[PDB]
Amino acid sequence: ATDEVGQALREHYPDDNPIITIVDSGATGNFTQTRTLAGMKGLVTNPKG
Amino acid sequence: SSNNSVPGAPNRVSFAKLREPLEVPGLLDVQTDSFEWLIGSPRWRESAAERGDVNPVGGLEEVLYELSPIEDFSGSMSLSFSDPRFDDVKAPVDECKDKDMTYAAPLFVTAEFINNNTGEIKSQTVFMGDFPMMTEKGTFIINGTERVVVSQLVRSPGVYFDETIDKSTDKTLHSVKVIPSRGAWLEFVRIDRKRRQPVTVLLFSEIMRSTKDNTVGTDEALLDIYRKLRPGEPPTKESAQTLLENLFFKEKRYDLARVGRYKVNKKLGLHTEEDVVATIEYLVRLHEGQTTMTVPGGVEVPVETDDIDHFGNRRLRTVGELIQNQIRVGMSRMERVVRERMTTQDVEAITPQTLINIRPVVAAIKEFFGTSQLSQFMDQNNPLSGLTHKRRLSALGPGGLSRERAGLEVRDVHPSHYGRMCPIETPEGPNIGLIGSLSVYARVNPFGFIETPYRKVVDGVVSDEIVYLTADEEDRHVVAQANSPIDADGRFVEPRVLVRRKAGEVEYVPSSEVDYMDVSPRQMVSVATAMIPFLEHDDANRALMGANMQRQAVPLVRSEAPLVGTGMELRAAIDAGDVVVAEESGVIEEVSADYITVMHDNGTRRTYRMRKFARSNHGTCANQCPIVDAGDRVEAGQVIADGPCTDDGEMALGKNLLVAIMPWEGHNYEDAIILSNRLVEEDVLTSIHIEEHEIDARDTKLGAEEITRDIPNISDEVLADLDERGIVRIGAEVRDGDILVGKVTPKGETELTPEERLLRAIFGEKAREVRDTSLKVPHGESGKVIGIRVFSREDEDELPAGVNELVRVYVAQKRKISDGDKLAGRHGNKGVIGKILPVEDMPFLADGTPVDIILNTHGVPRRMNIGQILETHLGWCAHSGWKVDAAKGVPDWAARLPDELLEAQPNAIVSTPVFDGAQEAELQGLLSCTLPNRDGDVLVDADGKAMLFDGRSGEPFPYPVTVGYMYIMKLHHLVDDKIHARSTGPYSMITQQPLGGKAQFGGQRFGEMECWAMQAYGAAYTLQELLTIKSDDTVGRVKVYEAIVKGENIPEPGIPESFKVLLKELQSLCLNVEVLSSDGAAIELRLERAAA
RNA sequence: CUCGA
DNA sequence: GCATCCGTGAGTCGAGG
DNA sequence: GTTGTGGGAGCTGTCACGGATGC
């Protein structure tokens, strides 16, 4: 479900959107951050791990 | 719609949609109520009558009951202590700070002595010592410095079972441990670091029947304990009996806890030996795995392994209890000498005063407050620092675990911390996970367990009856959530509700299954954390950083409350205790920059002295200003004067800055920050920093120093600012290097240079022969001399041995924001100032308004703290004001929350609570109806962006930029404090290397990894030079200086003194080390220039 | 002891 | 014949008091 | 010169490893 929402996000975003431009150009950051910012963070770890 | 309870508190409109069914408790109660228990004040009497049984006993009363009566071995005499009373306080707080005293009160007790064979009963009032006292703000004053007693986390007494797995076949192996209030412990029956102990060799059972054990009778199990734990002595029949009877049955040695006894009796049975039988049955029936267990006389106990981090088995010992335990230690050390004197002296001639030596109790209290890891230098950079410091909980210290024996599971957020210990506020460094802060609404209970409040739920009906539950009680119930839909009359609208159960897991249960409900969202948060707008929009790393950095803001000369905040600023400022608050409602009778007098209605006068330009423990400036005018009618609790970081009663840790979010010419590259020079010209980030230089004239071998304005061969002009005493004059501007207090130190005759010898001979000089040891101002420091304090041995001023005079110069400096300074928002978005641009080349809006701060875009998205962006948008809204169009109805986006937020004047004060308040849709809506500027121009569009001009070329920037208003704090990390260089300075007498630290004008350390780096380059000569003629070559370095001064090449390097010292240490280890030539014996290590 | 990278 | 008990490792550089 | 009664504070929430020792 997380990967699907990330995919829908990457589709909906215009490619000149600044949050996309900054990641794609290789400037800084990955798309997992784009996905947790808009979309959903997904599963989070346990105190055990 | 917040702050209605506090009179005069400004009107901060709140986006919240939930009613607050419970106000914040006394944010210092964690400290006060503890100390008031320790002392037995009427406050605590009433507070225990309201929520406690009828027989209360304070800390000192309890210590006395436990100690009474001091009895002779023959039972011939008995001493009994009772009725602890306090006199008034010795000296006020400011007086104790000034004189370097300890705020304290004399402690008195009634000591009744009885001789059982003479009937003589001579009662007496004995004095126990100067008991240090807790101030209004919840601190102590020791040696004139203010200190906090941080609550400690420790395992409450009781028995605990766990389930390990053996390295044999992964078999489920049970184990147990009994932690006592006092004494030794045991495990399964291994006891006191002596393993190989069969559980059946000391007395349906699965393995209890299997015990392997070969013995019968009671002498075998009695002798085995003396032969297995008391070695160095033959096996006897009486000594083992005596030790076994004095081990756990004896109450003097083994102190059965009260909290511990409660926990254990709750674990086994309502009503020692019974306990040990129940424990053996528990371990057995846990090795089996049965749900419940039936013990003789006791019933209804679940067979389960206990969690060591659960807040129902992990207590904290507040200041009261730490003090109580130190007092108990002192009291036992006194009782020892009391009995030891009862023995020797004659009866009927010994009064309570004659056999009661208080020296050990005084020494115990002193050692506690002066060496305990839990009596800490009060963090008081600003009010929030101190407020969180008092509410803090740490697990290190004497009695807890070790900073190195504390693994990672200790530092993990346990689900029972919900509403008790905030999960965000904790250090980033080594102490992470070990130091938390008490949750906002949390409250400690008599047993040291952290309780939290919940609203009672009766038939799916949220009531107003609040109840405080501990971790255990909470686990046993189902707690609804705070943001749960509720209709008026307390009725859940949805068919089911989200809730939390004992397993630390969430569920969606029908409404009729809920027991309690959260009192409010953010119930889990701490004070600092509760002040981050849009917290839920920030990742826990940057939020933790934001809390920690709020606790580092420096007070500014002029403080400005945040344009957009939470609801916590007011209550935080008030409880913190750095604002003056009207203790009694009246009318301001007089107001000055110095004091404020209020005439109560009953004719009473009360007056408050304003702290004016006070130096804090960390150099920040504590300076109060009144906010009342003569003739003003003030209600009780109303704020009378603002403190260091407060504005009209609200925590104002920073300023509202016009921010533009866009990369600007790289000067904000990689987290740097660009500031408009306005912030310098208008002192928007200027702060006051007050340092205290100190110097004493004392007794030396060659005589006694003297504080004198007459210093050897100093220019009359240099002393131009010294008074007749040799002390700088008040209001004098001191640059770095100037004299602050002249002082000469007796110099020996052998030290006089040949030049000085001849000078004193020819001109017939006197025999003073002193050295200039005057107190000069250290590098990178300057300012106006605020103050001068002086203490003379001549006068009746108490000083240490051999210390004649002692003067302290208090110097203030105004620090303007500068390149290098560290700023940050409330969202963990830190950065140093890369450049401060002229206002003219700052990007500016259409109306020429130049932005104040440029925050690089590249920094926002990866840190997961868009909270700052939402804050920027709402801040621009608040700076411009708005009017939602109501004609034809209220739009759907503004329908839900907005009540009096439908319109707002420019510079409106709004609060967006955490986990409630401003919703994204509502933010956008407000952004649509921004009011225009003077000329009716809307400058920020509905996206929150605006065109901007390049103040450098003149051309506009091609694309709209997000501009807004952001709250920026000046964190206490300033270049003026961190710049430091050294060409040559003092060295250590032991290693002969440069001293370390700026304060000592030290040198930088070229560490081992740096030498690795240097080698990797192959810079042999650089590494040698760094390690020989810059550090240790005692002749090489002076040669190098001499060669640089005379334009000569740098000499060849010699031998590091540290090597000679290593050789000497080896030798002292009986190791014969020796340096050898190519073909030779050991080389040895160890005038004409002067005559020239 | 707390804190900074 | 080996099983335990012990003794050794566990990042660097900076600031106060 | 000491002549009636007499066991203390401390860990005490670390882990992973390799090799004398000791029954």
PDB file of N, CA, C and O in Angstrom, chain B residues 391-416:
ATOM      1  N   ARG B 391      11.390  19.855  36.007  1.00  0.00           N
ATOM      2  CA  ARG B 391      10.467  18.768  35.701  1.00  0.00           C
ATOM      3  C   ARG B 391      11.159  17.561  35.077  1.00  0.00           C
ATOM      4  O   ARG B 391      10.488  16.695  34.506  1.00  0.00           O
ATOM      5  N   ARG B 392      12.476  17.477  35.189  1.00  0.00           N
ATOM      6  CA  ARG B 392      13.252  16.485  34.464  1.00  0.00           C
ATOM      7  C   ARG B 392      13.392  15.194  35.261  1.00  0.00           C
ATOM      8  O   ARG B 392      13.337  15.191  36.492  1.00  0.00           O
ATOM      9  N   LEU B 393      13.564  14.089  34.539  1.00  0.00           N
ATOM     10  CA  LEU B 393      13.690  12.758  35.122  1.00  0.00           C
ATOM     11  C   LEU B 393      14.888  12.070  34.487  1.00  0.00           C
ATOM     12  O   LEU B 393      14.897  11.841  33.272  1.00  0.00           O
ATOM     13  N   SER B 394      15.891  11.739  35.295  1.00  0.00           N
ATOM     14  CA  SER B 394      17.076  11.051  34.806  1.00  0.00           C
ATOM     15  C   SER B 394      17.250   9.731  35.542  1.00  0.00           C
ATOM     16  O   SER B 394      16.881   9.601  36.712  1.00  0.00           O
ATOM     17  N   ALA B 395      17.809   8.746  34.839  1.00  0.00           N
ATOM     18  CA  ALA B 395      17.980   7.406  35.385  1.00  0.00           C
ATOM     19  C   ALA B 395      19.386   7.143  35.901  1.00  0.00           C
ATOM     20  O   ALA B 395      19.600   6.121  36.563  1.00  0.00           O
ATOM     21  N   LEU B 396      20.341   8.025  35.616  1.00  0.00           N
ATOM     22  CA  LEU B 396      21.688   7.870  36.139  1.00  0.00           C
ATOM     23  C   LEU B 396      21.756   8.344  37.591  1.00  0.00           C
ATOM     24  O   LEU B 396      20.812   8.927  38.134  1.00  0.00           O
ATOM     25  N   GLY B 397      22.898   8.084  38.224  1.00  0.00           N
ATOM     26  CA  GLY B 397      23.146   8.559  39.561  1.00  0.00           C
ATOM     27  C   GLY B 397      23.278   7.443  40.577  1.00  0.00           C
ATOM     28  O   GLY B 397      23.053   6.267  40.281  1.00  0.00           O
ATOM     29  N   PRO B 398      23.657   7.802  41.805  1.00  0.00           N
ATOM     30  CA  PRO B 398      23.775   6.797  42.873  1.00  0.00           C
ATOM     31  C   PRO B 398      22.425   6.173  43.188  1.00  0.00           C
ATOM     32  O   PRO B 398      21.474   6.863  43.567  1.00  0.00           O
ATOM     33  N   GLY B 399      22.347   4.852  43.033  1.00  0.00           N
ATOM     34  CA  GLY B 399      21.128   4.102  43.250  1.00  0.00           C
ATOM     35  C   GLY B 399      20.455   3.626  41.980  1.00  0.00           C
ATOM     36  O   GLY B 399      19.711   2.637  42.022  1.00  0.00           O
ATOM     37  N   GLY B 400      20.684   4.302  40.860  1.00  0.00           N
ATOM     38  CA  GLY B 400      20.184   3.872  39.572  1.00  0.00           C
ATOM     39  C   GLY B 400      21.219   3.058  38.826  1.00  0.00           C
ATOM     40  O   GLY B 400      22.112   2.445  39.417  1.00  0.00           O
ATOM     41  N   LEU B 401      21.100   3.060  37.501  1.00  0.00           N
ATOM     42  CA  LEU B 401      22.041   2.329  36.672  1.00  0.00           C
ATOM     43  C   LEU B 401      23.230   3.221  36.316  1.00  0.00           C
ATOM     44  O   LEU B 401      23.305   4.390  36.703  1.00  0.00           O
ATOM     45  N   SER B 402      24.177   2.656  35.572  1.00  0.00           N
ATOM     46  CA  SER B 402      25.398   3.349  35.187  1.00  0.00           C
ATOM     47  C   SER B 402      25.311   3.804  33.736  1.00  0.00           C
ATOM     48  O   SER B 402      24.736   3.111  32.891  1.00  0.00           O
ATOM     49  N   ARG B 403      25.897   4.974  33.450  1.00  0.00           N
ATOM     50  CA  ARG B 403      25.899   5.504  32.087  1.00  0.00           C
ATOM     51  C   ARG B 403      26.494   4.519  31.091  1.00  0.00           C
ATOM     52  O   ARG B 403      26.284   4.670  29.882  1.00  0.00           O
ATOM     53  N   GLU B 404      27.228   3.517  31.571  1.00  0.00           N
ATOM     54  CA  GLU B 404      27.800   2.485  30.722  1.00  0.00           C
ATOM     55  C   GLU B 404      27.121   1.133  30.877  1.00  0.00           C
ATOM     56  O   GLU B 404      27.107   0.353  29.923  1.00  0.00           O
ATOM     57  N   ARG B 405      26.555   0.839  32.047  1.00  0.00           N
ATOM     58  CA  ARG B 405      25.751  -0.360  32.245  1.00  0.00           C
ATOM     59  C   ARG B 405      24.303  -0.174  31.806  1.00  0.00           C
ATOM     60  O   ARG B 405      23.472  -1.047  32.077  1.00  0.00           O
ATOM     61  N   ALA B 406      23.986   0.939  31.148  1.00  0.00           N
ATOM     62  CA  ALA B 406      22.647   1.206  30.634  1.00  0.00           C
ATOM     63  C   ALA B 406      22.665   0.993  29.126  1.00  0.00           C
ATOM     64  O   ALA B 406      23.233   1.801  28.384  1.00  0.00           O
ATOM     65  N   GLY B 407      22.032  -0.088  28.678  1.00  0.00           N
ATOM     66  CA  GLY B 407      22.056  -0.459  27.278  1.00  0.00           C
ATOM     67  C   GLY B 407      21.154   0.400  26.420  1.00  0.00           C
ATOM     68  O   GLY B 407      21.061   1.613  26.628  1.00  0.00           O
ATOM     69  N   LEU B 408      20.495  -0.215  25.439  1.00  0.00           N
ATOM     70  CA  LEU B 408      19.581   0.505  24.563  1.00  0.00           C
ATOM     71  C   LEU B 408      18.116   0.324  24.936  1.00  0.00           C
ATOM     72  O   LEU B 408      17.315   1.232  24.689  1.00  0.00           O
ATOM     73  N   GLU B 409      17.736  -0.816  25.523  1.00  0.00           N
ATOM     74  CA  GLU B 409      16.342  -1.012  25.908  1.00  0.00           C
ATOM     75  C   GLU B 409      15.921  -0.076  27.032  1.00  0.00           C
ATOM     76  O   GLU B 409      14.729   0.224  27.159  1.00  0.00           O
ATOM     77  N   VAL B 410      16.866   0.392  27.848  1.00  0.00           N
ATOM     78  CA  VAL B 410      16.535   1.379  28.871  1.00  0.00           C
ATOM     79  C   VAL B 410      16.058   2.671  28.221  1.00  0.00           C
ATOM     80  O   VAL B 410      15.106   3.308  28.688  1.00  0.00           O
ATOM     81  N   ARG B 411      16.707   3.072  27.129  1.00  0.00           N
ATOM     82  CA  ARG B 411      16.459   4.348  26.475  1.00  0.00           C
ATOM     83  C   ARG B 411      15.275   4.316  25.516  1.00  0.00           C
ATOM     84  O   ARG B 411      15.008   5.325  24.852  1.00  0.00           O
ATOM     85  N   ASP B 412      14.566   3.196  25.417  1.00  0.00           N
ATOM     86  CA  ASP B 412      13.480   3.078  24.457  1.00  0.00           C
ATOM     87  C   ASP B 412      12.184   3.632  25.033  1.00  0.00           C
ATOM     88  O   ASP B 412      11.896   3.476  26.223  1.00  0.00           O
ATOM     89  N   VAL B 413      11.397   4.273  24.173  1.00  0.00           N
ATOM     90  CA  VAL B 413      10.101   4.819  24.566  1.00  0.00           C
ATOM     91  C   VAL B 413       9.169   3.656  24.900  1.00  0.00           C
ATOM     92  O   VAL B 413       8.738   2.919  24.012  1.00  0.00           O
ATOM     93  N   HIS B 414       8.853   3.492  26.173  1.00  0.00           N
ATOM     94  CA  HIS B 414       7.910   2.464  26.584  1.00  0.00           C
ATOM     95  C   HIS B 414       6.477   2.970  26.408  1.00  0.00           C
ATOM     96  O   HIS B 414       6.211   4.161  26.581  1.00  0.00           O
ATOM     97  N   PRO B 415       5.535   2.096  26.044  1.00  0.00           N
ATOM     98  CA  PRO B 415       4.146   2.558  25.885  1.00  0.00           C
ATOM     99  C   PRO B 415       3.540   3.109  27.164  1.00  0.00           C
ATOM    100  O   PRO B 415       2.610   3.921  27.088  1.00  0.00           O
ATOM    101  N   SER B 416       4.035   2.699  28.334  1.00  0.00           N
ATOM    102  CA  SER B 416       3.508   3.222  29.589  1.00  0.00           C
ATOM    103  C   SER B 416       3.926   4.663  29.845  1.00  0.00           C
ATOM    104  O   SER B 416       3.360   5.303  30.738  1.00  0.00           O
TER     105      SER B 416
END
